[PDB]
Amino acid sequence: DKLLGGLLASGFDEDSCLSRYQSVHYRKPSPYKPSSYLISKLRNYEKLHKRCGPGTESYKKALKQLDQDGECKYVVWISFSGLGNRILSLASVFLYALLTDRVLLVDRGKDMDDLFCEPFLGMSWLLPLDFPMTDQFDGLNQESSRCYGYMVKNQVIGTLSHLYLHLVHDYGDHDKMFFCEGDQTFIGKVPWLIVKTDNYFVPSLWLIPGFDDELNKLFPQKATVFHHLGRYLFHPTNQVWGLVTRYYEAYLSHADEKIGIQVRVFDEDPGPFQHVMDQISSCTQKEKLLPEVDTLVERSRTPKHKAVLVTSLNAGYAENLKSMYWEYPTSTGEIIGVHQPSQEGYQQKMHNGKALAEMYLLSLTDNLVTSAWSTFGYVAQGLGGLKPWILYRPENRTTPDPSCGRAMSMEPCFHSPPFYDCKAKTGIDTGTLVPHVRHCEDISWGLKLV
Amino acid sequence: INSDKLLGGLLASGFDEDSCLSRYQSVHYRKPSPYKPSSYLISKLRNYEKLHKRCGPGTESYKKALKQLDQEHIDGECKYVVWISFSGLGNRILSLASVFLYALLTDRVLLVDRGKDMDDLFCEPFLGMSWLLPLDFPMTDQFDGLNQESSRCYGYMVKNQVITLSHLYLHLVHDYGDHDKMFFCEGDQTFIGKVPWLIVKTDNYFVPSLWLIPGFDDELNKLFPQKATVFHHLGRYLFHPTNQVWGLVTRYYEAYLSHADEKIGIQVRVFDEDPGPFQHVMDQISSCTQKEKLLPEVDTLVNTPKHKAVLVTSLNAGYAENLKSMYWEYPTSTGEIIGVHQPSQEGYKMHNGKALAEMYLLSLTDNLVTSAWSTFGYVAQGLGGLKPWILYRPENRTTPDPSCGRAMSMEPCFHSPPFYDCKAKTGIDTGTLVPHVRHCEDISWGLKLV
Ligand SMILES: OC[C@H]1O[C@@H](O[C@H]2[C@@H](OC[C@H]3O[C@@H](O[C@H]4[C@H](O)[C@@H](O)[C@H](O[C@H]5[C@H](O)[C@@H](O)[C@H](O)O[C@@H]5CO)O[C@@H]4CO[C@H]4OC[C@@H](O)[C@H](O)[C@H]4O[C@@H]4O[C@H](CO)[C@H](O)[C@H](O)[C@H]4O)[C@H](O)[C@@H](O)[C@@H]3O[C@@H]3O[C@H](CO[C@H]4OC[C@@H](O)[C@H](O)[C@H]4O)[C@@H](O)[C@H](O)[C@H]3O)OC[C@@H](O)[C@@H]2O)[C@H](O)[C@@H](O)[C@H]1O
Ligand SMILES: Nc1nc2c(ncn2[C@@H]2O[C@H](COP(=O)(O)OP(=O)(O)O)[C@@H](O)[C@H]2O)c(=O)[nH]1
Ligand SMILES: Nc1nc2c(ncn2[C@@H]2O[C@H](COP(=O)(O)OP(=O)(O)O)[C@@H](O)[C@H]2O)c(=O)[nH]1
Ligand SMILES: [Cl-]
Question: Ligand 3 center to residue B20 CA distance, Å?
């Protein structure tokens, strides 16, 4: 099923985006099926987009409104921050567009169209380069005159022609009013919304009345939001897809089982660090993801091949594993090969291409280990429909104990959620209101769907 | 008993299997050699085993021969040649094979000084006996200090015209001189053939000059009707990795190489004070493998392909990393699927085990590129019966042009030959006497069998 149970629309040009349908030959089928209601929501979204998208008459008339009522409403996502952040925040803004009957338009930035194919059949999701507010995207912040929070603060609130929503991690109490029901009703009248964020803000949408009922219908399995919208939205270009297929076929395709180890060390020193090496071997072995080796001369008595796919900025962790499985027999007899695609040293177009391909490769494994706080790993696990084991975030360069725990769900984590009761107008722990929105396993104040 | 498991009669049957798994199992991992050992050679090795059983360490005969060393002048039942463990592993493997050939030509028993690790690396080669020099051999504590000035050095005696003896030290190290080189003269071999105990220190593959000695020439021609198979046969006969080293081979083969349709070996050695890696060496490898059609070009302007595995060995990982990137980043011109693998990056016990394992892994490839001057490469090509493509030694950090050329034959090179006409007692170019002994491709000073 190259259509993912109805999630994807047929009729795309194969050759211009090989990954779209051809990736069926590379993963196992997801056991999570999209709701019939979500499928209808997306087919109808594509009709709205054909009706209102760039190049249409309707879109031209709506531009003239920004400048000088209407039947077209929009939300523009600004390109900003690292790739993991961009994939997650873009999926969030898309969900928000579905909840508000808006058209999503994508600021291409430097490379989004170099990485990702078109997701909406017959139109394009890219904001035209001549959109007349493009020169202001960089400057837009909490002090912008059309920043919603800045307008609340100054108490400046007819209907505005447009509104900027500051949803970056450094946002304040006024910006956070975005997550309140009364504020959403006001914002819903504004034709043009511009969003900047580096967070996966999905979970808090489930706490806004009105949205909650719609979300219930869209995702009866509440923790499939990113798994469905992410696989629907993001398809690597042929350039990026080449890195995926060539690495898969050369190094991973002959394995009975594949284990992804997504290694991310939030430290200015590049390492590698012995305590992280120790965390990894500790985790994979105590969870029976990888076998022990032993030093007995007398051996006991066809073996499965396991490929270990390690992604990191530094290759020391994979080299450590490689050596160990080369130097010693496994206690179970299994055959273990360790593979790492790259060692880029730090974040830096070939670099973004490689990072996307590596997230994609991780999403092709059978069992996945990820690193606490890493959105690199959230993307991999979401696209793969994979519930990882999480390597907890170490303090004072001490190997955490326990070294890892299983995730509650495959969902990404919202790192900077609001902690606000809109009704009582006072603070509250938003991770203790409903059973399906809980604090994240890797970051105690984050939120995620379960 | 001319089973492929016995290398066509080269190996004797009857060895205990579990104590040396590599011995007969070598068959599962290589293809069979098209070079058949002559039945003359097979008879000579069986009869060498009878003599070794009669005269070997611990026998009543050995013990009786030890008493000849309890005096300056000595007729016994048994004569020996003792090899001193000296120099790097590639040097030791080749020199030991040369001394063994010399033992065969002089009806002598070979005893092997185990040094620090010969018995941790190699199994016993002579059915029913040990080839190790006993640890209480009277002269072992002299081995380190024997040299050209030693009173018992044959060359010293020749120089000072002071010539039966019970023993004689033969200095056959690369720094030897004109009087030591007299070893390679027929008249001197007649004197030497009288001495029951010879002690040899060498770091050279001295085989080729034995072919220029009357007497030996006739026997060599019967032993090796295909002249350039000397090391291929004796090396395969003598050297079998212990179980601990064989585990390095099999685990690496099974994890990384076993699914390939073709394997290309690239043995990289850079004789330079800096560790590198050097761009001009990368360019050389790239040029060599592409112009010789060993590895395909890539398309930078983009049904059932074959899987080709590239096995790179080097102290520095920079060359394999560069190849791996190029083949990941760009599609092959041919559609071939290319995987790049390097076992170790030693940088400069477990170490000697890995070096030996890496030599054997190279010896398992289908086509082999080697570095000029490198006995590491000589061993690997010899064990595999591979005629390599040689990367010429570069001067002044310039990529040579041509970058590589096919060897004249699979034989190793003798780096420090004598150039002396024994009969006319005068200098001569020993590389221009007989068609089957020529100057090496990679070092014009040396000689090889062709
Ligand atoms: O006793 C406390 C003590 O803490 C000391 O710091 C500790 C402590 O850190 C708490 C703090 O962490 C922030 O995350 C840091 C992280 O610690 C760093 O490791 C990391 O370093 C990066 C760096 O940013 C890079 O530029 C550099 O090159 O490399 C390093 C290492 O890889 O930086 C992050 C912050 O990065 C964000 O900000 C800077 C941007 O440049 C960057 O792009 C951006 O990253 C994005 O951040 C978002 C966040 O949503 C998301 O993760 C993206 O994926 C990512 O790309 C946290 O950001 C911050 O929240 C922590 O502060 C605590 O926050 C609590 C929750 O409040 C937030 O969420 C809810 C919302 O309602 C709030 O408005 C919002 O603020 C809060 O309750 C609490 O009071 C805060 O302390 O812990 C870990 C330890 O490692 C640190 O050393 C501190 O120095 C000391 O003074 C003292 O306070
Ligand atoms: N190729 C590659 N790039 C990485 C890796 N880890 C980190 N990076 C780079 O650093 C960035 C990390 O930022 P982001 O993607 O937002 O994820 P996060 O910072 O881990 O939450 C990545 O996007 C890459 O550019 C890796 O394993 N492989
Ligand atoms: N493991 C490993 N060791 C190497 C490699 N290249 C060189 N060495 C080390 O350096 C030594 C080189 O000396 P020798 O073996 O006599 O061969 P040569 O010096 O290349 O002629 C080897 O024995 C190894 O210990 C390599 O690719 N892998
Ligand atoms: Cl450390």
Answer: 24
Length of chain A: 450
- Ligand number with the minimum distance to the CA of B203: 3
SS3 state of residue A405:
strand
- Residue A28 to residue A17: CA distance in whole angstroms: 20
Q: Chain A: which residues have CB within 8 Å of chain B?
A: 238-239, 242-243, 246-247, 249-251, 254, 303, 305, 319, 325-327, 329, 335-337, 341-342, 350
CA–centroid distance, B287 to ligand 2, in Å, is 34
Contact B327 A250 (CB under 8 A): yes
Rounded to the nearest 10 degrees, the angle between the axes of helix B375-384 and helix B89-106 is 60
**Residue A342 token pair:** 């790259």
The set of residues, in sequence order, having a beta carbon less than 8 Å from that of A23 and lying 6+ positions away, is: A235, A241
Taking the C-alpha atoms of residue B409 and residue B231, their distance in angstroms, rounded to an integer, is 11
What's chain B's length in residues?
450
Which among A394, A329, A279 has a CA at the least distance from the CA of B254?
Answer: A329
Q: B357, B252 in Cβ contact below 8 A?
A: yes
Q: What is the DSSP string of A300-313?
A: ---PPEEEEEEE-S
* Residue closest to A124 by CA, chosen among A50, A197, A29: A50
Between CA A320 and CA A379 the distance in angstroms is 26
Do residues A113 and A16 make contact, with C-beta atoms less than 8 angstroms apart? no
Please give the method by which this entry was determined: X-ray
Rounded to a whole number of angstroms, the distance from the CA of B160 to the nearest CA of chain A is 53
CA distance B372 to B404: 9
Rounded-to-10 torsion of CA A214, A218, A221, A222: -50
Domain ranges of chain A: 1-450
Which residue of chain A is at minimal alpha-carbon distance from B329?
A243
Residues of A in contact with B254 (CB under 8 A): 303, 305, 335
CA distance to A306, A340, A400, per residue, from A280 (Å) = 16, 15, 10
Distance from CA of B166 to the nearest CA of A (A): 44
Q: Which residues of A touch B331 (CB under 8 A)?
A: 242, 246
Strand residues in A170-278 grouped as ranges (E)? 192-196, 257-262
DSSP state of A360: H
Question: Do A245 and A26 touch, CB atoms closer than 8 A?
Answer: yes
User: Closest Cα to residue A178, out of A198, A155, A207?
Assistant: A207
Nearest to A255 by CA among A388, A380, A361: A361
Token couple for A11: 């009729």
Question: b vs e for B347-371, b when ≥16 Cβ sit within 10 Å of the residue's Cβ?
Answer: eeeeebbbbbbbbbbbbbbbbbbbb
Q: Chain A partners of B255 at a C-beta cutoff of 8 Å?
A: 305, 325-326, 335-337
Q: Which ligand is nearest to the CA of A346?
A: 2
**B-chain residues within 8 Å CB-CB of A319?**
345
